[PDB]
């Protein structure tokens, strides 16, 4: 149960291979006639609130975002239908990941009857068809989880902070779409570790991942900005979520001023 060592490396290697395949197009939004990064941010922030209302796993949120970006990478969608795509994505991510997925009627309710059950179900079908049933995507969440094992003893505050930072990356397609989940996870982990303990990305992780602290830099600079400007951001659902003691209220922590790195 607690032990995970035998297939640990195989799983990490497999995920690193999946992430460069289950990849959305970095600038796909330029090719959408009617929707923008701001609309996407509003959608994701809403999905965060939905996940909180229904007590869904963080993994479910990350998966839903993955589905949405892949779907929007190949399908034009009008703004009035964007929430329908997001609802279907959350439903599918829930069915894949949750023990108890919320029922469809409940999903229709949290959109305030903006769409019908028939629409949600028809959209579910379309998303499955467009993703070709490839739902088992790697997420920033899965990489963080493995990275946390290098913390001995465990540090729950560091873990919550890293998760918080990882979730903030979901909101802004620019610039986070350009970084692989494993790299975002890496920058998030380092930044959380540093903020809480002053320690840095471990050599054991650098070895395992192939990422030196130098290779994290570009992403880490962006994540640091995002962290500093979080109280200013138009979207606030994630900060509110991580103020709870459930997450050691890590969104109340002050970001470091500089990284000197």
């Amino acid at each position: 149960s607690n032990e995970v060592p035998d297939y640990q490396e195989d799983i990490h290697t497999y995920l690193r291979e999946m992430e460069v395949k289950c990849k959305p197009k970095v600038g796909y939004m330029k090719r959408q006639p009617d929707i923008t990064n701001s609309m996407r941010a509003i959608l994701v922030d809403w999905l965060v609130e939905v996940g909180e209302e229904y007590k869904l796993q963080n993994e479910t949120l990350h998966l839903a975002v993955n589905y949405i970006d892949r779907f929007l990478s190949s399908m034009s969608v009008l703004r009035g239908k964007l929430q329908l795509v997001g609802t279907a994505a959350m439903l599918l991510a829930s069915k894949f990941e949750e023990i108890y997925p919320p029922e469809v009627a409940e999903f229709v309710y949290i959109t305030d009857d903006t769409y019908s059950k028939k629409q949600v179900l028809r959209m579910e079908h379309l998303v499955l068809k467009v993703l070709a049933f490839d739902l088992a995507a790697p997420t920033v969440n899965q990489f963080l989880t493995q990275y946390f094992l290098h913390l001995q003893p465990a540090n729950c505050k560091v873990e919550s902070l890293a998760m918080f930072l990882g979730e903030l990356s979901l909101i802004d397609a620019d610039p986070y779409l350009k970084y692989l989940p494993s790299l975002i996870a890496g920058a998030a982990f380092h930044l959380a570790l540093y903020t809480v303990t002053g320690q840095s990305w471990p050599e054991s992780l650098a070895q395992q991942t192939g990422y030196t602290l130098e290779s994290l830099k570009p992403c880490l600079v962006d994540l640091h900005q995002t962290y500093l400007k979080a109280p200013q951001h138009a979207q606030q659902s994630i900060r509110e979520k991580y103020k709870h003691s459930k997450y050691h209220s890590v969104s109340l922590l002050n970001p470091p001023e500089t990284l000197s790195v």
Partner: peptide
């Protein structure tokens, strides 16, 4: 799981 809370059109 489920603890429905509120309903929003975006």
């Amino acid at each position: 799981p489920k603890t429905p809370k509120k309903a929003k059109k975006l």
